[PDB]
Amino acid sequence: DKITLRMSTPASETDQRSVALAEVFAPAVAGFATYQPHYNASLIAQNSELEAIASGDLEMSIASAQELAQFFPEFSIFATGYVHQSAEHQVAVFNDPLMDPFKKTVEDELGIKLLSVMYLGQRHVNLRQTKEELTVTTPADLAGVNLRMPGTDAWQFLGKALGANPTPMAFTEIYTALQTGSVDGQDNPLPTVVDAKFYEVTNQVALTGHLVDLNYIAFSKAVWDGLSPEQQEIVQTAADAAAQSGREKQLAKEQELVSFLEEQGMEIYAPDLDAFRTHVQEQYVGSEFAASWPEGVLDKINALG
Numbered sequence: 001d002k003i004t005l006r007m008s009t010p011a012s013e014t015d016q017r018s019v020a021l022a023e024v025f026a027p028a029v030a031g032f033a034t035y036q037p038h039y040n041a042s043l044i045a046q047n048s049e050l051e052a053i054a055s056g057d058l059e060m061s062i063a064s065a066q067e068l069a070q071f072f073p074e075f076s077i078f079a080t081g082y083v084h085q086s087a088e089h090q091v092a093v094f095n096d097p098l099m100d101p102f103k104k105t106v107e108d109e110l111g112i113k114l115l116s117v118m119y120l121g122q123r124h125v126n127l128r129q130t131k132e133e134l135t136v137t138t139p140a141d142l143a144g145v146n147l148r149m150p151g152t153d154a155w156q157f158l159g160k161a162l163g164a165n166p167t168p169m170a171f172t173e174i175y176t177a178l179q180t181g182s183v184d185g186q187d188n189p190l191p192t193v194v195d196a197k198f199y200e201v202t203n204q205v206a207l208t209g210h211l212v213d214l215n216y217i218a219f220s221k222a223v224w225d226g227l228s229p230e231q232q233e234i235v236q237t238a239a240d241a242a243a244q245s246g247r248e249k250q251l252a253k254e255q256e257l258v259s260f261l262e263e264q265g266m267e268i269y270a271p272d273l274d275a276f277r278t279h280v281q282e283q284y285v286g287s288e289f290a291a292s293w294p295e296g297v298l299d300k301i302n303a304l305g
């Protein structure tokens, strides 16, 4: 009997992360495990997947530092505006010994292994307003903008730190919120802007680049522990191979889609990034998030970039 591996994500079927797991991870483990993905948060709500793995109702998810920070506030360090520099930097950080205690905490306290880090992409402010209606140059320009952000404290804080007035909303609700004007904008990376067709209901992207964002491939520790050494090696290899494939494809999308978006009439332009970075840094000073970061870890992350 093969082990069933149920995976739940709010991501679509066509998202590069989903594709990588389905086309690279799934066939590699198929000899002993059957991958069973659920997209669009049909099975488990966004931000409830970790709990579902811990409670034996799910085996895998595409988790985030923000989701983990709900349980272990120190994970907020990996979800902090302007800290990660690139996809390559994320990999260096995840593989550095600094990550060891973070990984151990999740295993010991949630019964979940973080197998791999995946690249999600550069988050930017995507607004319904045209550039002429609202030009984003400094954080002051986002005053009073109702910016959707995902529903966790660290996510809301990031939206606030940009200068906007964040509102929490599940990923699957964004399109309709933009269509009806219940929010002014959202911040998913360009491949998602296209995949989810947010460009049909917005007019600009201000390239704030405020979070070079990532996910983790989360995997039940109970399942892992029941696998043979050979099977564990295959699962780890399959997860890393999927992350690597997805990363390359996501980066390619990120490069090519600017022109596609502009062809759809989107205005895509950079603000004053020095001004944004400086402002966001000072927003974190004095915050609960800053106080949760273990000694020396931020400096270590910086040095790896």
Ligand SMILES: O=C(O)[C@@]1(O)C[C@@H](O)[C@@H](O)[C@@H]([C@H](O)CO)O1
Binding pocket: 009, 010, 011, 012, 015, 046, 062, 063, 064, 150, 170, 171, 188, 192
């Ligand atoms: O809700 C989102 O905007 C977000 O980008 C948050 C990410 O952590 C991740 O959960 C993502 C989903 O995978 C959908 O792409 O949604």
